[PDB]
RNA sequence: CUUGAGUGCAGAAGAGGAAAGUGGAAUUCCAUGUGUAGCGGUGAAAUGCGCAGAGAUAUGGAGGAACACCAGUGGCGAAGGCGACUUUCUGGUCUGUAACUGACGCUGAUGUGCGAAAGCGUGGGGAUCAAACAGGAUUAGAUACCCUGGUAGUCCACGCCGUAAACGAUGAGUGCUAAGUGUUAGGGGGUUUCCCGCCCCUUAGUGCUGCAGCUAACGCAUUAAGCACUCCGCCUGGGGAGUA
């Protein structure tokens, strides 16, 4: 969905300081688990018709702010396309 | 986590003692998972405004119950229709 | 009985089409005593429709109403037509005792599909 | 699972299959099994009877524990297997006690499910039990007649019973043949449609497999020379001219009843429509 | 002492009041879903 | 406020229906509009359980 | 670097969807009872039903549908569409805060997926309604209107088809440009002994009236058809023809 807590949790291994909320790390990590739920979700339910399009729509935001971080470092980039493992 | 308030509803016609074993046995149905009940009731002997099957009026009676999403209706409200005594019933959330 | 059944409190159902309107008089639960209907009292088309049709049935089964003998009868009214106010002034001259009059014509739940012409 | 041949040759274009996702295993018991033979449809005396029967693949017989006479002990199973004298799939069973007896497969039985055959066993599939103690609207199957004497009906594939309503005796029933016959309201019974559900959704595809069955040929009656039957005969093809379409045998088939007036289930019978 | 006219004028307005008339009036013959909403958006302004 | 209804508030379901078995609209009321879409859900709830009819017509 | 965009923090509402599960009325039928002679429908009639006892009345049962009042120029939805209730899962939206990132944005050919009703297929179910259809009546004539019935279908799942007056006949986004009046979700201030009463301000949406400006004219006018910018798509007399 997802919890508040486990929300809050996972910025905690993958902020880069500790007052982070952006650090878009976060973001695609969130929206990473996030989209594996509802993918799963929409498993069950095959169809829904506003489900896949919040999909889209995480996906073309979440690849956009890849392009940002990849466009800014590269160290950083595959190191956690190789630790969320996404990507080939 | 969540707090599930419960309805159940038995006929008047029914002796007592049927009424105290379904109480304790259905209360066992629920906290058996561990949801925690948590707040029982008897509204009482009560009129209605409608005869449900050929009835008159019968007992209303509350029971609330706290605990995680997935524990309660999975039997309860199957053994609603297995429950000859029991008429009608009906759950909600906050 | 059971021919004659002997009460003191029966019903008087009441219809009124818009181009019918028929009468009928039984007991509490009920069962029947006696009706009547405009085409019956020879009219025909519009005449069954009217409100002088409606008093001359209810009097006409209500004379066999009191055959058996009865003098309150409560009121069953469907069927929304014109002769719904006339007929009932008739039945109070009748010779009867009315105690209640509650209209019952349903209007469902939506439920069903009506026709669609016109 | 159904599944799609592509044809390839002549033989297999139209065909379907089963795909066999609802089995654990391949190989049976040694123990509970009985050989069979095949008569092929005829009489001690030798006499065929019966018309296109016979001509078949091996078999064996596997026996079923209908009566489920053992109650209130518990069980489960331990897999599903085919079984080939009938169109739906049998699933085995391991007591708790320790003895095996193959019975049905309902929809959706899984392993390590447990199981009981008691008055005291509350609804659920193949606790089997007497149908007095039932609710209205429940599908069952492998139901007794007279008690005592083994499961008799709704016990093909799919679809079953289903319980319409009680008298305190006897009680009632809807079927799939969409009629009702009063029943004891002592009998045993089940709970639960029966498994293979799409044993009637095959394309056999060719002649062989109804010959690998076995089945064999039937022949029609406007090619006999008549001295066979009725509609043979006609030079040229057979527009048939006597009415009531008739039966090798005479006594027509089509419309007319068999079904007699004088059996004892004069009473029980109410609503009959499927036949 | 309230004659069978009075009642008779109680039970008009238990037929006027409860809208037994205008329901069987909307449900005598068939109204397509969106007809009902060209009405109401035509009787949007009159009132 | 701030919570309902479900079957609490009888002096105000009756306050809010006619006696026949309908609702009285928003209009006669004047009431908020969230109270009004809480309350007739809380009717609903209430009449499935039957502490008051779906046509009291007689 | 933050004022753009976005995540956070605290809040708010919602016929938003998919699966599941109950409930009541109401029609049709059936059984039973009462009980006699018409019911039904019409512009006026007949077709039809009726002594095998109809219709009416009344109890009970069946099962399929659609879920009354609330309901609002009300809301939600990207669009189609979304209205009995409850449950499980889930997305989306607005407000205020802002400490975080630090311009990551707009458009978008190609491409890709959603998509009214009708319809096709595998099946299932099938109460009402009714193309087709049968019949009466009407008509100079009536294959039609009108009346009587009745199939497909309407209904569920799964697939397919991929169109419409799919309409705000107004492409997406950004920003400025007089007012006044309402309705919806919020927020903030004041007053009030407590605002529940009320006043004031603001965001977002939503309607109504109307300056400037535009307009061929109708008319739009802060939800622009004004003022400008960026991107896409589209038009070049009509017919032939969205046809070969």
Known sequence: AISQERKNEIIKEYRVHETDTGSPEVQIAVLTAEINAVNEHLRTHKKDHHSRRGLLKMVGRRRHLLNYLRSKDIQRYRELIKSLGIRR | ?94 | ?118 | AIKKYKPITNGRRNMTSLDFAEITKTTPEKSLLKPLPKKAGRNNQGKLTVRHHGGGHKRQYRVIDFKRNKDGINAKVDSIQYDPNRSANIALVVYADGEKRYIIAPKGLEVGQIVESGAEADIKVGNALPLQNIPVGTVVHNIELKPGKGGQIARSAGASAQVLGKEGKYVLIRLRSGEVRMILSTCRATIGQVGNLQHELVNVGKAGRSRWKGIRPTVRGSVMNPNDHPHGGGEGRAPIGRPSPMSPWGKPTLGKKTRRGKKSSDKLIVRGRKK | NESLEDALRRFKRSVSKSGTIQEVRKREFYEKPSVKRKKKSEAARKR | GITHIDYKDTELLKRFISERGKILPRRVTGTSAKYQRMLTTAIKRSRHMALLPYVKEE
Request: charge should be positive; include cysteine; charged fraction near 30%.
């Open chain 3, 1 to 118: 009985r059971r021919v004659k059944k002997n009460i003191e409190n029966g019903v008087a159902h009441i219809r009124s089409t818009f181009n019918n309107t028929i009468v009928t008089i039984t007991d509490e639960f009920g069962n029947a005593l006696s009706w009547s209907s405009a085409g019956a009292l020879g009219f025909k088309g519009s005449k069954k429709s009217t409100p002088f049709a409606a008093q001359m049935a209810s009097e006409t089964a209500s004379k066999s109403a009191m055959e058996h003998g009865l003098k309150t009868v409560e009121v069953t009214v469907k069927g929304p037509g014109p002769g719904r106010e006339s007929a009932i002034r008739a039945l109070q001259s009748a010779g009867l005792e009315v105690t209640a009059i509650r209209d019952v014509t349903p209007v469902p739940h939506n439920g069903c599909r009506p026709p669609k012409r016109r």
């Open chain 2, 1 to 94: 986590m969540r707090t599930y308030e419960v309805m159940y509803i038995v006929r008047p016609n029914i002796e007592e003692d049927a009424k105290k074993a379904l109480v304790e046995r259905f209360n066992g149905i629920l906290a058996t998972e561990g949801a925690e009940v948590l707040e029982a009731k008897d509204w009482g002997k009560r009129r209605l405004a409608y005869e449900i099957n050929d009835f008159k009026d019968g007992f209303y009676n509350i029971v609330r119950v706290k605990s995680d999403n997935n524990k309660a209706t999975d039997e309860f409200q199957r053994l609603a229709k297995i429950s000859d005594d029991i008429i009608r019933y009906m759950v909600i959330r906050e």
